[model samples]
Target: CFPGDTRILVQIDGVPQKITLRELYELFEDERYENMVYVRKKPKREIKVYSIDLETGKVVLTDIEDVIKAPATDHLIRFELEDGRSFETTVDHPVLVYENGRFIEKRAFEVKEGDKVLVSELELVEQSSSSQDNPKNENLGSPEHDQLLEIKNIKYVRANDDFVFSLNAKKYHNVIINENIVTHQ
Candidate 1:
């Protein structure tokens, strides 16, 4: 889950907006989110969110199934990339990492210094490599673009907000936030 103050890029009611999770929670609680009716836990209607298509490695709009809020967390882990982009989330939040010549899911705490993370804008070589030693998995295509930013630094920060937030994407199970791709709870 992300911190309350973290900015998330969301398309609310056909307009792109960058809203904080705290404000989103408040808006939901007040039944003021794009005419959404309030329910006990989940939203009355799903909203469209930005996500990546795993097959094509391209950005696409996906549905957000849920807006989740968890209990107070003590601290958060800050992930800073070599390109100077950063975001903060709980240690247990899921993040995408490129490993073993494929994209794999990993927890934020499990990511280390040398691991590469998914970012917004970067180019990846087409048909880079194959896991098999024979390396027969070569194909003809345009440059398969996927930015994998190396971790520059990781920092632990004391929490200033009480709650953490996360969004459940209906299709891809991941969402792009702060120009970084992260998975749901």
Candidate 2:
């Protein structure tokens, strides 16, 4: 949890906007728009790759279990493990999987054992304004160039592994300043 004096400043694609915890809560409660939510939880393990014969439509499970031949598919494939575990994943593009000592063409699958995967759910509030305006514009600016000054004197609470902080909406402002050193004569 953040201390009683922590503030989080956010800039959307460097446009600059201030949002408070209360405002965020209100925005979340709104059902009219889609909201992106972040969730952190333990990951799951499933199949990484499966091979299918080009000449035949039969699924080659041996390629996945024994030979470990990672195969590419034109469409998403569904698989059922010997343990009755079932899941669906996409194979839209070829991926490289490393097994034994070689990197082979296969769908590199992530096996979630005990560690949680942090997922941020962002709801598209609206369709992107336009590609011509600025392609670099984003909800979150690049961490390197953008400035999000942390505010001082705020308390935060923790729920599970998630930390929540509240801010005062009125005290926030966004401004663009030149990137250079100014000299006073």
Candidate 3:
């Protein structure tokens, strides 16, 4: 689970919007979210989010099945990446890691500095495509492309009475927090 304030990338009616998990939960609490564009009243289809196919390195679109909230875990850690992006989560949360020629899931506490984690190049979608020498853009070059980012540091933070949240996507079962891939229950 992630701290309630962690921002996740989501698409509402094809427009990219970043919203905190706690805010998302509140939207669902009232009937307002049901009336939002992402929610389809007839069949109840709602919320498109970007997730990855861990096996193929493919960025895919999926719907959030549900949102879960609970008291923040005592072992809260903030993971800072080489690119200056960071996210906070419980030590037990699973984050995608690249190792031994394969991508695997490792708990936050098990990860260390220099470890490579998966990230999606969200901004690349807006850049001009004239440059072909960019090896980072070699694979499709869309915002859906996945890239590996190195962990710079991990530090534990004191826990409080705050709540943590997790989103359950229909497939992939993961979501991007601070552009980093994290698995959810």
- Candidate 2 matches the true fold with a TM-score of 0.16
lDDT of 1 by residue, 1-185 (tens): 77766656555555344456665454343222332322223444344566666556666676665565655555777777787767776777767776787677777787776666665442222212322232222444234444577778888875557766665556734766665444443
Ranking by lDDT: 3, 1, 2
Q: Write the per-residue lDDT of candidate 3 for residues 1-185, one digit (tens) a residue.
A: 77866767665545444567765554353221331212211113245666767777665677766565566646677778887877776878877778898887777787777777777666434334322322242446444444688879889874433667666566644887666455543
Estimated TM-score per prediction? Answer: 0.68, 0.16, 0.73
Q: How many backbone clashes does candidate 1 have?
A: 0
Q: What Cα-based lDDT does every candidate model obtain?
A: 0.58, 0.22, 0.62
Clashing pairs in 2: 4-154, 5-154, 12-139, 13-138, 13-139, 36-121, 36-122, 36-123, 37-121, 41-116
Clashes of each: 0, 10, 0
Task: Give per-residue CA lDDT, model 2, range 1-185, as digits (tens).
Answer: 11111212223342222233222222222122112322221112221111222223222221011110112222232222222222222322122222333323332133221211111111222234332342344555323222111112111212211222221122111111111100000
Model 2, which residues run further than 4 Å from truth? Answer: 1-75, 93-98, 101-105, 108-185
Highest lDDT model number: 3
Q: For residue 115, what is the lDDT in candidate 1?
A: 68
Off by over 4 Å in 3: 30-46, 124-146, 159-161, 180-185
Model 1: how far is 168 from its true place, Å? 2.3
Candidate 2 scores a C-alpha RMSD against the true structure in Å of 23.1
The CA lDDT at 82 in model 3 is 84
